[PDB]
Enzyme design. Structure first.
Site, PDB file in Angstrom:
ATOM      1  N   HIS A  41       0.945  -1.196  -0.212  1.00 26.16           N
ATOM      2  CA  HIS A  41       0.102  -0.068   0.186  1.00 26.16           C
ATOM      3  C   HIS A  41       0.870   1.075   0.029  1.00 26.16           C
ATOM      4  O   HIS A  41       0.240   2.398  -0.087  1.00 26.16           O
ATOM      5  CB  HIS A  41      -1.167  -0.102   0.963  1.00 26.16           C
ATOM      6  CG  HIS A  41      -0.615   0.232   2.647  1.00 26.16           C
ATOM      7  ND1 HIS A  41      -0.114   1.359   2.838  1.00 26.16           N
ATOM      8  CD2 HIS A  41      -0.496  -0.338   3.825  1.00 26.16           C
ATOM      9  CE1 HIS A  41       0.239   1.647   4.006  1.00 26.16           C
ATOM     10  NE2 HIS A  41      -0.167   0.524   4.499  1.00 26.16           N
ATOM     11  N   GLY A 143       3.205   6.535  10.126  1.00 26.41           N
ATOM     12  CA  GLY A 143       4.312   6.274   9.840  1.00 26.41           C
ATOM     13  C   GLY A 143       4.892   4.953  10.266  1.00 26.41           C
ATOM     14  O   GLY A 143       6.183   4.720   9.787  1.00 26.41           O
ATOM     15  N   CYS A 145       3.979   2.050   9.518  1.00 25.95           N
ATOM     16  CA  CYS A 145       3.892   0.986   8.603  1.00 25.95           C
ATOM     17  C   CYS A 145       5.048   0.374   8.229  1.00 25.95           C
ATOM     18  O   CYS A 145       6.097   1.090   7.845  1.00 25.95           O
ATOM     19  CB  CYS A 145       3.006   1.433   7.458  1.00 25.95           C
ATOM     20  SG  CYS A 145       1.267   1.754   7.837  1.00 25.95           S
TER      21      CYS A 145
HETATM   22  O1  LIG Z   1      -0.502   4.170   8.954  1.00 24.41           O
HETATM   23  C1  LIG Z   1       0.405   3.469   9.242  1.00 24.41           C
HETATM   24  O2  LIG Z   1       1.641   3.979   9.260  1.00 24.41           O
HETATM   25  C2  LIG Z   1       0.383   2.241   9.906  1.00 24.41           C
HETATM   26  C3  LIG Z   1      -1.186   2.021  10.495  1.00 24.41           C
HETATM   27  C4  LIG Z   1      -1.189   2.642  11.824  1.00 24.41           C
HETATM   28  N1  LIG Z   1      -0.757   2.332  13.077  1.00 24.41           N
HETATM   29  C5  LIG Z   1      -1.180   3.142  13.970  1.00 24.41           C
HETATM   30  C6  LIG Z   1      -1.616   4.380  13.557  1.00 24.41           C
HETATM   31  S1  LIG Z   1      -1.759   4.387  11.710  1.00 24.41           S
END
Ligand SMILES: O=C(O)CCc1nccs1
Ligand SMILES: O=C(O)CCc1nccs1
Ligand SMILES: O=C(O)CCc1nccs1
Ligand SMILES: [Cl-]
Ligand code: NA
EC number: 3.4.19.12
Lengths: 305, 306
Positions: A41, A143, A145
């Site tokens: 993604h 961030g 991810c």
């Molecule tokens: O969007 C990302 O970097 C990963 C998904 C998330 N995990 C916690 C907040 S958002």
């Protein structure tokens, strides 16, 4: 003495973390040998995330559309392919800090260390259990991810988790390193919810053994039980059924402490039925279920890799 | 988006861990540039446990009585000195993995990561606080002495703790990296006991702020308190006195949540009176005191789940 939620030393994995950017999307990648692994993604905008066609979005991308940064060094991408929900970027340089590793898929109830990262920079490390509902109760911000989960066995890193998303209840979902989701989740912006969770029985028992080894003994009693009698109590309290395999796995701790697994099940029955009567076990007022039997043996005998 | 006891990534400390052997005693040392730091009690023997004279035991050692092993490499000791309760072995090789580092002495209530090590090999990493009674509630077995505690703010490792011994209650005592003990403890086997411990009030409040940032308000109330009335109640539960310094330090968390520090104090007074009524806060059924205000801001969102 003492019993703490303890992560594996994270140094072997820190040397593998990189930053991956595609358009305006930055997240973390795992650089092993000559391949950078990251969530597919990364190739999506927010528009894309509503109903993404990953095949379609990727064929329109070329190698130069992936910016891979290892500290202050740009890696040259020379190939890009998709495996399930993971993007693989072949780079022209093997990671000189690649440890001995393999990819493993873990079972619900098994534990691992997460190295939380932001912009390719390691931030923190903590221990997680893969919940029976295939979520993890992590600590992750925008961030994070592509942050990864792992175990260490001797000198071998076993990679088991890559972070993809947060669910509306504040719990987290991700894949193995082959891009297969843990649990009934998809990588799209849509309505998704953690199923009702259950308590990992064999781990509560392990943690009760840890407590006894550390001199916390008030909950012990003269009684024993049967697997069938206990499992009727478990079902009532939203505990996983105890199998003969679990009883076998606790064998060591049963032997070392002189409390038989079904002797300890009789303790756990009384705690579920009666509560802790204002007392604590290993500094908790809850029954802790994110330590495995291995975790307890490991921590209580000083294994070192 | 979750709230966990999170340690610093341990890699920068892993590359500094070595084994030190003197006589039949082996423990951990910390190799920074061309110096290895370890507990001086490595030079003690089975009789020199109660009342060791470290100056007399040390003057009897040559550089070659210390075996220092970095993985499979033996390091050559070319100098030795004692500073308080730490031995400093000069070696003929600077550690190529030395990170940017400093030594800092911390105050009670501060948190740090511990890299538990055996025979100079890392076993695991966890978070600790310096307790008000100058102990830590660690996880340490025989051979863990020389294990260190550290923070990593902005690529620089601040070493704050070196592990020396376990007290009879199963808690842990050690020194800063200048070899000064935290608390009234000594590196002797004479009878020693931790003082009565207290709860780190400022950290409990920071953690309640964490719970609000992550979207939980059930424990708040419509009341406020004076700082003095709060301290009179809190001390009846063995809580540390909250100072105006602690109030000031909570200001940014107060600002992010729009809950005044003394209003959160009124919520804590009520939780102490009522307990949690079978509810949990951030996955705990107890009030957690090992997250600092700085830890909550590091880990938590800049935006509050209202
Ligand atoms: O969007 C990302 O970097 C990963 C998904 C998330 N995990 C916690 C907040 S958002
Ligand atoms: O620690 C000491 O100084 C004496 C210990 C002893 N061991 C044997 C006889 S007396
Ligand atoms: O520190 C050592 O290596 C010996 C004494 C102990 N310290 C911690 C647990 S037992
Ligand atoms: Cl401090
Ligand atoms: Na029993």
């Amino acid at each position: 003495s003492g019993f703490r939620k303890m992560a594996f030393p994270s140094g072997k994995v820190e040397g593998c973390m990189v930053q991956v950017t595609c358009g305006t999307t930055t997240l973390n990648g795992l650089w092993l040998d000559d391949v950078v692994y990251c969530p597919r993604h990364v190739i999506c905008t927010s528009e894309d995330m509503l109903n993404p066609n990953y095949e379609d979005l990727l064929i329109r991308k070329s190698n130069h559309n992936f910016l891979v940064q290892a500290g202050n060094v740009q890696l040259r991408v020379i190939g890009h392919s998709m495996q399930n929900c993971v993007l693989k970027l072949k780079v022209d340089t093997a990671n000189p800090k690649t440890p001995k590793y393999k990819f493993v898929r873990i079972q619900p109830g098994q534990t691992f260390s997460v190295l939380a990262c932001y912009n390719g920079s390691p931030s923190g490390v903590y221990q997680c259990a893969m919940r029976p509902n295939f979520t993890i109760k992590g600590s992750f911000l925008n961030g994070s991810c592509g942050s990864v989960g792992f175990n260490i066995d001797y000198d071998c890193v076993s990679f088991c988790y890559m972070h993809h998303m947060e669910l509306p209840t504040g719990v987290h979902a991700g894949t193995d390193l082959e891009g297969n989701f843990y649990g009934p989740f998809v990588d799209r912006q849509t309505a998704q919810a953690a199923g009702t969770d259950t308590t990992i029985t064999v781990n509560v028992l392990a943690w009760l053994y840890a407590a006894v080894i550390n001199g916390d003994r008030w909950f012990l009693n003269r009684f024993t039980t049967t697997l069938n009698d206990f499992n009727l109590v478990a079902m009532k309290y939203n505990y996983e059924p105890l199998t003969q395999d679990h009883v076998d796995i606790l064998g060591p701790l049963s032997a070392q402490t002189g409390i038989a697994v079904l002797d300890m099940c009789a303790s756990l029955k009384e705690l579920l039925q009666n509560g802790m009567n204002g007392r604590t076990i290993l500094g908790s007022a809850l029954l802790e279920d994110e330590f495995t039997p291995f975790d307890v043996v490991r921590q209580c005998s000083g294994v070192t890799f």
